[PDB]
Amino acid sequence: EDMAKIYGAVAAVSKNVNSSVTYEVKRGTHELIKVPTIPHNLVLIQSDNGK
């Protein structure tokens, strides 16, 4: 029983080893939008007689 407790403690510290890290690479990314209409700014001014 004493040996079982000693072997258990040793195995516990052997299992305390890291494997990897996982994360997300999202900094710098932004969401795009869509503009449906071209913003022209033209008006036509004509005289009453059309001259």
Partner 1 sequence: FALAQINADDEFIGAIDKESAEYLDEYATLARDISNSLTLVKAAFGPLER
Q: Provide the binding-site residues for partner 1, judged by CB under 8 A.
A: 2, 6, 9-10, 13
Question: Distance between CA atoms of 32 and 51, rounded to whole angstroms?
Answer: 47
What is the closest distance, in whole angstroms, from the C-beta atom of residue 23 to partner 1 in the complex?
Answer: 29
Question: Distance between CA atoms of 15 and 7, rounded to whole angstroms?
Answer: 12
Concatenating the DSSP letter of every residue in 1-23 gives -HHHHHHHHHHHHHS--------
Using the minimum distance from each CB to partner 1, give the nearer residue, 13 or 42. Answer: 13
What is the closest distance, in whole angstroms, from the C-beta atom of residue 21 to partner 1 in the complex?
Answer: 24
Using the minimum distance from each CB to partner 1, give the nearer residue, 11 or 21. Answer: 11
